[PDB]
Design an enzyme around this catalytic site. Structure first.
Site, PDB file in Angstrom:
ATOM      1  N   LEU A 275      44.424  42.148  45.063  1.00 22.79           N
ATOM      2  CA  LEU A 275      44.608  40.898  44.354  1.00 22.79           C
ATOM      3  C   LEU A 275      43.264  40.287  43.925  1.00 22.79           C
ATOM      4  O   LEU A 275      42.266  40.373  44.643  1.00 22.79           O
ATOM      5  CB  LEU A 275      45.357  39.938  45.283  1.00 22.79           C
ATOM      6  CG  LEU A 275      46.779  40.322  45.664  1.00 22.79           C
ATOM      7  CD1 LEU A 275      47.436  39.237  46.510  1.00 22.79           C
ATOM      8  CD2 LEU A 275      47.637  40.565  44.431  1.00 22.79           C
ATOM      9  N   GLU A 276      43.254  39.615  42.770  1.00 24.96           N
ATOM     10  CA  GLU A 276      42.108  38.783  42.413  1.00 24.96           C
ATOM     11  C   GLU A 276      42.057  37.577  43.342  1.00 24.96           C
ATOM     12  O   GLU A 276      43.013  37.268  44.039  1.00 24.96           O
ATOM     13  CB  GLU A 276      42.117  38.340  40.947  1.00 24.96           C
ATOM     14  CG  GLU A 276      43.213  37.354  40.562  1.00 24.96           C
ATOM     15  CD  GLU A 276      43.414  37.334  39.053  1.00 24.96           C
ATOM     16  OE1 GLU A 276      42.397  37.043  38.332  1.00 24.96           O
ATOM     17  OE2 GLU A 276      44.553  37.627  38.602  1.00 24.96           O
ATOM     18  N   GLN A 277      40.923  36.882  43.361  1.00 26.13           N
ATOM     19  CA  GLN A 277      40.837  35.722  44.248  1.00 26.13           C
ATOM     20  C   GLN A 277      41.928  34.676  43.992  1.00 26.13           C
ATOM     21  O   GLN A 277      42.474  34.071  44.916  1.00 26.13           O
ATOM     22  CB  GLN A 277      39.474  35.077  43.995  1.00 26.13           C
ATOM     23  CG  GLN A 277      39.267  33.794  44.760  1.00 26.13           C
ATOM     24  CD  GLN A 277      37.964  33.171  44.334  1.00 26.13           C
ATOM     25  OE1 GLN A 277      37.132  33.780  43.644  1.00 26.13           O
ATOM     26  NE2 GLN A 277      37.794  31.945  44.784  1.00 26.13           N
TER      27      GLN A 277
END
Ligand code: NA
Length: 371
Positions: A130-132
């Site tokens: 996941l991205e932040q």
């Protein structure tokens, strides 16, 4: 068609579902065909499964990029080939601008889509990357584990280890950190974690006798690798515990692959890994962003010339197998084997059905002791 799981040490590489990615130092990562990937990449992570178009709704999917010039059939054929070499192909969930914002009740549909893709392309599992902005977006912390548990159970029922990995950015791995619900909810489901030890600047850890050891400190690289890994594998210095057998060190391929975190001197990694090995907690392997960067160009159009695989491939694959491994000794004539005793013979595994000695697997007929 065939779920192909890794039980040994891994060298993990991400594969770009896009052409001509631009580097951090102005370089170029081209799209490459799967069958072109260096064979020492034994786990290849297809990037990414994502919401391409929010009008399709909240459930991420995967679409092969047209511009890679590869029919769907042909890409499936290359997966099959990798699988025939005993290599895995995972589908990486997430990445930058993935638009993954799932709400409670989405897990059924997400698991259905995971399964549809998996049966279609022949993926061996799934990397949570996941991205932040997605780590605690909407109900992702609930939905993603809930879905992945259902997927794991589905394939366990049918003989198979659907692999679950994760690529947390390492500062989210403090005890009670934002990543840790993914880890606790999927404990006993996940295969290994390959954290990103890159793109996090001065983030690091403090060690007495040493000082602050930052992720962008190239002068203290061996100390960084060693202590950040030792903290994780022991659950110490305020890190969440990931056991060494489930811990793979994620790195940039080169200075174009990430802002920071590239290992200038691979002796820094060898020496850290050997200390971890000598303390009875060897790591499971390495990971890289990315195979495409490791085959890509710098700003002056100089090839990076597969230097990351050159530096780590043989190092990791020459390691002793981890606890995950399946060791199956060659058949022997003078040996007495019993119900469920597997051996290897003629390049195949045979499984004793009952008491046997001197009976060679393959000569035993169709309903003799070897099966
Ligand atoms: Na497969």
């Amino acid at each position: 068609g065939t779920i192909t799981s890794q039980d040994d040490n891994v060298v993990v590489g991400y594969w770009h579902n896009w052409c001509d990615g631009r580097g951090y130092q102005g370089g170029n990562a081209p799209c490459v065909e799967l069958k072109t990937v260096n064979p020492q990449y034994n786990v290849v992570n297809i990037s990414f499964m994502k919401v391409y178009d929010i009008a399709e709704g909240r459930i991420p999917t995967f679409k092969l990029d047209p511009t890679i010039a590869l029919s769907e059939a042909e890409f499936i054929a290359q997966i099959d080939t990798l699988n025939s070499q005993g290599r895995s192909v995972l589908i990486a969930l997430g990445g930058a601008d993935a638009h993954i914002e799932l709400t409670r009740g989405d897990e059924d549909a997400l698991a259905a889509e995971i399964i549809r893709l998996t049966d279609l392309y022949g993926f061996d599992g799934l990397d949570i990357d996941l991205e932040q902005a997605a780590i605690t977006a909407k109900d992702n912390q609930f939905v993603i584990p809930a879905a992945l548990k259902m997927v794991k159970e589905h394939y366990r029922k049918t003989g198979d280890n659907f692999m679950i990995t994760m690529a947390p950015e390492f500062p989210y791995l403090t005890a009670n950190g934002a990543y840790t619900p993914y880890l606790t909810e999927l404990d006993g489901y996940y295969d290994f974690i390959n954290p990103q030890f890159y793109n996090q600047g001065g983030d690091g850890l403090w060690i007495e006798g040493v000082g602050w050891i930052a992720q962008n400190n190239d002068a203290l690289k061996e100390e960084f690798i060693y202590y950040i890994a030792d903290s994780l594998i022991n659950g110490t210095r305020n890190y969440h515990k990931i056991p060494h057998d489930k811990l793979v060190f994620g790195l940039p391929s080169n200075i174009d692959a990430a802002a920071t975190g590239y290992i200038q001197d691979p002796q820094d990694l060898y020496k850290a890994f050997d200390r971890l090995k000598a303390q009875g907690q060897p790591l499971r392997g390495v990971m890289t962003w990315s195979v495409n960067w490791d085959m890509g160009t710098d700003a002056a159009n100089n090839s990076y010339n597969q230097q990351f695989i050159k530096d780590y491939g043989n190092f990791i694959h020459n390691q002793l197998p981890p606890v995950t491994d399946v060791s199956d000794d060659d058949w022997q004539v003078g040996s007495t084997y019993v119900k469920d005793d597997k051996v290897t013979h003629n390049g195949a595994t045979w499984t004793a059905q009952w008491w046997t000695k001197g009976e060679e697997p393959g000569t035993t007929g169709e309903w003799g002791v070897w099966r």
